[PDB]
Design an enzyme around this catalytic site. Sequence first.
Site, PDB file in Angstrom:
ATOM      1  N   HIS A  47       0.811  -1.200   0.000  1.00 51.06           N
ATOM      2  CA  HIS A  47       0.000   0.000   0.000  1.00 51.06           C
ATOM      3  C   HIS A  47       0.852   1.260   0.000  1.00 51.06           C
ATOM      4  O   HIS A  47       0.493   2.239  -0.648  1.00 51.06           O
ATOM      5  CB  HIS A  47      -0.921  -0.023   1.208  1.00 51.06           C
ATOM      6  CG  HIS A  47      -1.747   1.250   1.412  1.00 51.06           C
ATOM      7  ND1 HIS A  47      -1.397   2.292   2.148  1.00 51.06           N
ATOM      8  CD2 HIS A  47      -2.966   1.534   0.845  1.00 51.06           C
ATOM      9  CE1 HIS A  47      -2.336   3.195   2.055  1.00 51.06           C
ATOM     10  NE2 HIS A  47      -3.271   2.735   1.270  1.00 51.06           N
ATOM     11  N   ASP A  89      -6.103   1.647  -1.992  1.00 48.80           N
ATOM     12  CA  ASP A  89      -6.846   1.416  -0.773  1.00 48.80           C
ATOM     13  C   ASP A  89      -7.705   0.167  -0.824  1.00 48.80           C
ATOM     14  O   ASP A  89      -7.766  -0.578   0.155  1.00 48.80           O
ATOM     15  CB  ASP A  89      -7.706   2.638  -0.498  1.00 48.80           C
ATOM     16  CG  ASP A  89      -6.944   3.894  -0.080  1.00 48.80           C
ATOM     17  OD1 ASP A  89      -5.727   3.866   0.075  1.00 48.80           O
ATOM     18  OD2 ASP A  89      -7.586   4.921   0.102  1.00 48.80           O
TER      19      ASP A  89
END
Length: 121
Positions: A47, A89
């Site tokens: 991420h 996300d």
Amino acid sequence: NLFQFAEMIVKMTGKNPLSSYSDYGCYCGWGGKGKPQDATDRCCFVHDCCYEKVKSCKPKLSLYSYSFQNGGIVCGDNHSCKRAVCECDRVAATCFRDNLNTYDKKYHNYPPSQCTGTEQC
């Protein structure tokens, strides 16, 4: 933005993001050094790499568009920069759900001395 990343985390894992994903391992929340300790920490690392690849859309400040569909997230943007932040996300939050079996409280408030070395994106 991170209000939306937090929205995705509570719906996918049932966990509160401040208690569970703000300090875990070497990369969830306050980290950025060392090697991913386990799979959850790896979701955080991927991420962070994802966010650096979309440096120009202002990831944390960018308000994007999505919906929850069939026990999953669907990013619904046309606009390239916002669809990409949404996708970072989306996969990190589903990555957290996939790895709740290995989630170990051992890694909460993890000692900095344990984050040793470098991992390359």
